[PDB]
TrEMBL record, chain A:
The gene is cbh_2. PANTHER family: CHOLOYLGLYCINE HYDROLASE (PTHR35527), HYDROLASE (PTHR35527:SF2). Pathway: Lipid metabolism; bile acid biosynthesis. It is an enzyme of class 3 (hydrolase). One of its GO terms (biological process) is lipid metabolic process. Its EC number is 3.5.1.24. This is choloylglycine hydrolase.
UniProtKB/TrEMBL annotation, chain B:
It is an enzyme of class 3 (hydrolase). InterPro entries: CBAH, CBAH/NAAA_C, Ntn_hydrolases_N, Peptidase_C59. Coiled coil: none annotated. This is choloylglycine hydrolase. Pathway: Lipid metabolism; bile acid biosynthesis. Keywords: Hydrolase, Lipid metabolism, Metal-binding. It comes from the Bacteria. Mg(2+) binds at E90, D91. Belongs to the peptidase C59 family. It catalyses: cholate + taurine = taurocholate + H2O; taurodeoxycholate + H2O = deoxycholate + taurine. Residues 1-312 form the Choloylglycine hydrolase/NAAA C-terminal domain. GO terms for biological process: lipid metabolic process.
């Protein structure tokens, strides 16, 4: 998975979800008066409205990534082999991993608040379904200040990191992702000046030889480095549709195509969907592996004082526009 | 630019066109009785119909890439700094660079036929319009056999290469592109076996560490290596919509996003459009940088006995489906 | 800097010291009855004899790397920007950073002993003059195992070292994670699972090492030396072992001009030490002298009380074959 | 193999010989009146003297690399899978591959002269006893070099802008691959990678993080071009020789890293450094790190007998006690 915060003028938050199997994800709006029943926290019957991608089980949204009506966004990203959750304790605020997005977006408005208010939180090992383990995750949190934090629960506890590059993928731990980034400090989008072999005329046979060592792999570090680069150099001061178009192209630059990421014999991890959520406007734009067309759901076109989940299809078939048809005249 | 021939069941031929500025490209069907007038070749008043992406000037299609009604495909890809064209010569068949796609598609049906009949060819330095240079190009040619050839005119003349990887980008010369692939021979889509430090347990902390050195650059070699990999490992035995979807994802893997390939201060080469042509069906599928939705034009729903160019818009605005 | 523990038969411990400034290093033997005076530890007037590379100031050996008569070795390596030292505190055993090699080698015999007894240790911010240099350490012994000792912002950590090598930054767990990025490297030719069904042009020997790092930076040197060490010969006698040891560190040597640390200022491999743990023999050479020199600790009076000092840096010692 | 021409003040020409088996190589001085019996050229009983590394069989120097008394240098480097030799023909000057170094150094003085005189040359398929596939680096005291390659398309002579050579691929392809490393710098790059982001510049020389360290031919070529280009200038004799050995050591092959068969490894067997001005050969080998030196001009160059010294030596340890 790859998640980004993109700040051309408005602010846009979303992710690729890359995996080998779908889990019934949908587009889900949770209105202000849907009652959240948290495993070890008091129920919230009145809260901020939110919109994101979620599975729905027993009338409960299991969010993958979402934003709330105040312009805060949270995305959960696979963290297998690095994450650790901990038993419920009487002296911490226990948030189960599957409810982290819901609780944060129900309650909080800004990244600054989330950072100061995780000091007494424990990410618990509670799962939604009995006899089933919770998925191992870490989180990107971003807001309309254009800044983000990374939240990781690992064997040394809960950590919150300022995110200087507004992107996140999977393993390794976040400080280690930032160290690896500097290994690419010599990369440039155009042609480097020749300080490699001064006095020699190199055969500059292709454009953008400065990106010859930019990573294109499907692994977590390759996708992190490349999406950081694509995000940093993306256009700015763009209006809504141009911004959304640019956002999808950033995440497409680290798309996982079927065949290239083998996780088992003839089993492939691929980009199942891509979400793009406008923090200012409460609009979720999306497409998926089978449908290249971008779709949009505006949370603010619904009744946010209601109490039931509002659900739309996420996964769609290829929506081809047939320019040509039989000539009747 | 990046071009491929994809053979999951039907055969699909097409390309990314990556540049900084558009050249009036549109979807153009040339029907059987449009009269081709060539600089140094007999006129062809009757020929195979074709569909592809072209600029139109003076009622003449200037094709970027196209397929014909018999399932032959030709794509012209930028080859600046490597291509060389030559003055017309009496002892050769002279094809001007800008007419190469039109001529080959009007006249031949198979890759084999093209190879056989290029033996006496000179790619001439003639340009379409007076006082404008011919663009430097090389070409990928593919058909329904699932095989392709690369055609390159350079300082040593004309060369035709069998293409074992069914892909093409820009510089360097094609044998050099092929040698560079061997530099990636240890890449795998999954996890490698640890013969790097035998006896040590490595922390295989991410999926697909076998692709950690797969190139992701915007330069011509990086795109060639990566697209060869994406094409080789793509699904097979797909139906029409699934095959088209997978085709676009293959070329999406080497898409050039604005900002990443700088060809001048604040001037960027990016993926302007993506074409995907079904060789069996004569259907052209396309999208562009500004419109993610795939559009389709079926050549066989037009009147192929006509004599005039049939033209459709290529570049479109983002076509968002508003759900609620 | 690059330090290794090499275990072909006997056990060899040593390092390249890569820097832009020399600081008066010599070969120094400290006999058993030289009195160590530490800043916050009891004085040691009787202890283990050691041999290594040190600067001598105020009749006091400031070791860079050394081994003791029992076959324990400690090498200090630059850790700038990562190390953190702490004020002396009453609840801990405080070892100053510049005393670490002297104290550990004076007092302990094995890596296991060093590990057990670091549990209450604080690396103090005490200098030798009036600032200490930021360091971390490799500790190895004749079991063929080694540990890494790092004091950082989270305090003191001791890591088992599965690869028996150490360079500079980043923190040791990050160095291990980065190794997995090279899991597909092999010394020979990889099998082609990159483009199955395509015959690649395997044009050079050892294409499996095409992505092996050759940079002068800390991570590149770490990855490469781990590879060279892991694949080096075994079952060798003394001279063959020493020769192979020097070649391993040679594989990651820094040549003047490639590591620019300031305007026309370069970090380069100033010396290379190789110490036989079983035999107490230090072998060395330096940037200006390719010939290997040898000092045997056990050819000295180790019950003595004074430092025994030999020249480290030497001019090129050329054997002139013909004359007149 | 890796060969370089290094021009700090005097000019130094030499190579690493990387292989898995030795072939009786020794240091050989061939004096002016040794009679060269060329395969398909007239014999030469009076010619330039030369010094370098060679096998000797049937009183014949089979040179690997050498320089002559006039400051010309030629190194043969493995080129397996790329080189092609051709049958002896009546209308070309045929030079067998195993005698190319001998003939060039016996006959010519400068790189320009060699270029002019290769126009009608055929590198023939004649073998001394098949012939090993080679290509050649030729350099002189001008500080310039050329690459001589006989392949499928015939004999080619290339100007060498980087004064280095390894093995495959063909030389223009080596130069193309060089440009892939255009972004490498010896120190820290300016931050045009992620402008406005403070990177963790955690190591010195992060500019070289993508510099190749492989044992393969392209890795060694790129690295040695960089090491050679950035080496010190204006050095005196011993300082230059020291720097020269370090340049080649930056691409040396340690036993175990280059597997060419089951427990069979290609490694750096010897390293030669020949001063073009002074006619001195310096050498060491895998088993002896001490540099040895043979001076051609301390011998009788009006002689006719080969003058031979041992090349491979035991590790020459200086015992300080
Ligand atoms: Mg408690
Ligand atoms: Mg003839």
């Amino acid at each position: 998975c790859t998640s980004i915060l993109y700040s051309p003028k408005d602010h846009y938050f979303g992710r690729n979800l890359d995996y080998e199997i779908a889990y019934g994800q949908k587009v889900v709006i949770t209105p202000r008066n849907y009652e959240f029943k948290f495993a070890n926290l008091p129920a919230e019957k009145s809260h901020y409205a939110m919109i994101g991608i979620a599975a729905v089980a027993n009338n409960t949204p299991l969010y993958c990534d979402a934003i709330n009506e105040k312009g805060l966004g949270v995305a959960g990203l696979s963290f297998a082999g690095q994450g650790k959750y901990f038993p419920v304790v009487e002296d911490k605020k226990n948030i189960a991993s599957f409810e982290f997005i819901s609780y944060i977006l129900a309650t909080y408005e800004t990244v600054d608040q989330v950072k100061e208010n995780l000091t007494d939180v424990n990410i618990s090992d509670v799962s939604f379904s009995k006899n089933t383990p919770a998925s191992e995750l870490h989180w990107l949190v971003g807001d309309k200040t254009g800044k983000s934090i990374v939240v990781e629960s690992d064997e040394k506890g809960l950590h919150v990191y300022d995110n200087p590059v507004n992107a996140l993928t999977n393993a390794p731990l976040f400080p280690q992702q930032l160290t690896n980034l500097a290994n690419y400090a010599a990369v440039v989008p155009g042609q480097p000046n020749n300080d490699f072999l001064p006095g020699v005329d190199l055969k500059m046979y292709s454009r953008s030889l400065g990106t010859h060592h930019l990573p294109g792999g499907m692994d977590s570090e390759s996708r992190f480095v490349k999406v950081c680069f694509a995000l940093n150099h993306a256009p700015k001061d763009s209006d809504e549709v141009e911004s959304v178009t640019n956002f999808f192209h950033i995440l497409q630059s680290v798309e996982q195509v079927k065949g290239m990421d083998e996780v088992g014999p003839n089993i492939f991890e691929y980009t199942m969907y891509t979400s793009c959520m406008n923090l200012e406007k409460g609009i979720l734009y999306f497409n998926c592996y089978d449908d290249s067309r971008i779709s949009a759901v505006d949370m603010n076109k619904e009744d946010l004082s209601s109490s039931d989940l509002i659900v739309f299809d996420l996964f769609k078939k290829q929506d081809i526009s047939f320019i040509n048809h039989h000539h009747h005249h």
